[PDB]
């Protein structure tokens, strides 16, 4: 009875003075906007209906029309930024925040959903949702002794909308807002539903992507151990955001990185660095490169966990992006590691996998590899075994590579190559 209407019919019903006719027309609009194939969002917008839907959102006496217009506006705001802007310009933000207090959970859920869609457009609409005062009523919906008493979908949508209020940068979410939200995020990170856990890890990942003060807000809440626990989950949808959050925390201070080491993260990296997913391997090797860029006690923690062989394996076979992050890890290890540690590197078999990558077209990776070779040679001088290193590099096909790199279009490549080809070869 409300299926396959026309925008003309929907408009004729919404512009009647019959609340039941308007309810029928708004339901027909919801069903139109609920279709997977080309929902006529732009036709509905041009018809001038968003204002009437927003006005229906305030009809507490007809909760059904509230719910239907909430659903309709949710799906309009789910689209392009211009469409979400139509929704916002109609005055829907304050109305949805008012609906967050509805006695009907199917209506407050839709208000949560619509505000999540609005805040997900970008930082400006996120901050406008926060200025209209959404965080207090949103977190109030989660103020329960046990979260398991709520409904799966309700909690999932609340967690999602909360993660979208932590999302986007330039600017990053307001600090007072992050402080208000984090406590509830920790609870949700300790929930049992994998969807809630995945969106909570995504939220933490957003909050940790920035200056070390943000990383510190998060780390000071004691979440690293739980993120490392979820890093070993069997559901990749949870492992990906968790690995991203841990890798972001490793971009800050050495003390913050130590928090990750102390939590046990390194014991999971044998599997992450052999993971069938290319992006898991890339993220894990990048995080390793930022750990090898830290203190020598942390490089020693890497060594102790048997992860140097896994980095050798990644430089031997992986996506070129993962191989490049591995090369960066090696260069950082050799730049700030002890001599003994560099000798361990060479004893694990780094030379040949590193030299077979001096045939790549990317210039940066060549620079990184050559800097690492230089570091290893310098470490060999302190031991007086640069001839052994030279024989090694020459017996895997390396000297040919460096010699040819002299004749490389780049300049830094040529000069580095030549200094190596002279001081040692």
């Amino acid at each position: 009875g409300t299926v396959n209407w026309s925008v003309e019919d929907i408009v004729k019903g919404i512009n009647s003075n019959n609340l039941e006719s308007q309810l029928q027309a708004t339901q027909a609009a919801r069903k139109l906007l609920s279709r997977e194939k080309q929902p006529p969002i732009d036709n509905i917008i041009r018809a001038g209906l968003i204002p009437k839907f927003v006005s229906f959102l305030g009809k507490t006496d007809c909760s059904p029309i509230q719910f239907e217009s909430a659903w309709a506006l949710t799906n309009i705001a789910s689209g392009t930024s211009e469409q979400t802007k139509a929704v916002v310009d109609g005055g829907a933000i304050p109305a949805f925040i008012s609906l967050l207090a509805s006695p009907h959970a199917h209506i407050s859920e839709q208000a949560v959903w619509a505000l999540g869609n609005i805040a997900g457009d970008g930082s400006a609409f996120r901050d406008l949702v926060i200025k209209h005062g959404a965080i207090d009523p949103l977190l109030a919906l989660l103020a329960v002794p046990d979260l398991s008493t709520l409904a799966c979908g309700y909690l999932r949508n609340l967690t999602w909308t909360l993660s979208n209020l932590c999302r986007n940068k330039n600017p990053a979410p307001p600090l007072d807002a992050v402080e208000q939200i984090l406590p509830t995020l920790v609870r949700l990170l300790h929930h049992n539903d994998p969807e809630v856990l995945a969106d909570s890890c995504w939220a933490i990942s957003y909050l940790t992507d920035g200056p070390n003060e943000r990383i510190e807000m998060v780390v000071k809440k004691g979440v690293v151990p739980q993120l490392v626990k979820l890093l070993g989950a069997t559901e990749l949808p949870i492992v990906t955001p968790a690995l991203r959050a841990i890798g972001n925390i490793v971009t800050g201070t050495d003390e913050q990185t130590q928090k990750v080491i102390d939590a046990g993260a390194l014991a999971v990296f044998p599997s992450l660095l052999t993971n069938p997913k290319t992006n898991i391997q890339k993220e894990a090797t990048w995080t390793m490169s930022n750990i090898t860029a830290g203190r020598q006690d942390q490089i020693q923690q890497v060594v102790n966990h048997g992860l140097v062989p896994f980095l050798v394996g990644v430089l031997s076979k992986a996506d070129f992006k993962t191989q490049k992050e591995a090369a960066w890890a090696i260069t950082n290890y050799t730049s700030g590691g002890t001599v003994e540690q560099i000798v361990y590197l060479v004893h694990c078999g780094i030379i040949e996998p590193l030299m077979n990558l001096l045939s790549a077209k990317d210039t940066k990776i060549i620079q990184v590899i050559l800097d690492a070779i230089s570091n290893i040679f310098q470490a060999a001088e302190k031991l007086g075994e640069t001839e052994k290193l030279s024989i090694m590099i020459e017996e895997c096909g390396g000297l040919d590579k460096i010699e040819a790199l002299q004749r490389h279009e780049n300049e830094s490549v040529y000069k580095a190559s030549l200094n190596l080809i002279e001081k040692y070869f």
Partner: peptide, 8 residues
């Protein structure tokens, strides 16, 4: 995490 998601 999808930036925006519709219902049905």
């Amino acid at each position: 995490c999808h930036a925006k998601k519709p219902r049905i």
